[PDB]
């Protein structure tokens, strides 16, 4: 039965252009080359923090599947309340 699973270095698929677009929408005109790796660091910390709490909600409900609600409850805990996915 033992399934697929991958632990690639997926962080690099948060590419330079994608980060440039995020900055654009944030009104940034010019970007130091040191920004891209710095942004990946930040993003990773953000996701670690949200995912940890979402999975804590998952474990508590004795589920194997993370739900939108787990994410939403996690984001509310982190003071980053999200509209549109339930709750």
């Amino acid at each position: 039965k033992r399934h697929r699973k991958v632990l690639r270095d997926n962080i690099q698929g948060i590419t330079k252009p994608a980060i440039r677009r995020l900055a654009r929408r944030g009104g940034v005109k010019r970007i130091s080359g040191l920004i891209y790796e710095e942004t990946r660091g930040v993003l990773k910390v953000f996701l670690e923090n949200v995912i940890r709490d979402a999975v804590t909600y998952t474990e508590h409900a004795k589920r194997k599947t993370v739900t939108a609600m787990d994410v939403v409850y996690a984001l509310k805990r982190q003071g980053r309340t999200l509209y549109g996915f339930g709750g």
Binding site: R25, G27, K29, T81, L82, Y83, G84
Partner: protein, 57 residues
């Protein structure tokens, strides 16, 4: 307020952008929902003055 933003963009139906434009252009609703993220809302057009073309002048 959203209905009016929909009417601007020449749309019959309110979508998340219209809510976001509504809320963030209203002093008070923006304060009420200051810590709230509207999925599929974007942000308001805002380019800081210093960043606009001054250039050779």
């Amino acid at each position: 307020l959203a209905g009016n933003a929909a009417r601007d963009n020449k749309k019959t139906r309110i979508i998340p952008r219209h809510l976001q434009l509504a809320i963030r252009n209203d002093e008070e609703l923006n304060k009420l929902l200051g810590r709230v993220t509207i999925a599929q809302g974007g942000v308001l057009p805002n380019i800081q003055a210093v960043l606009l073309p001054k250039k050779t002048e």
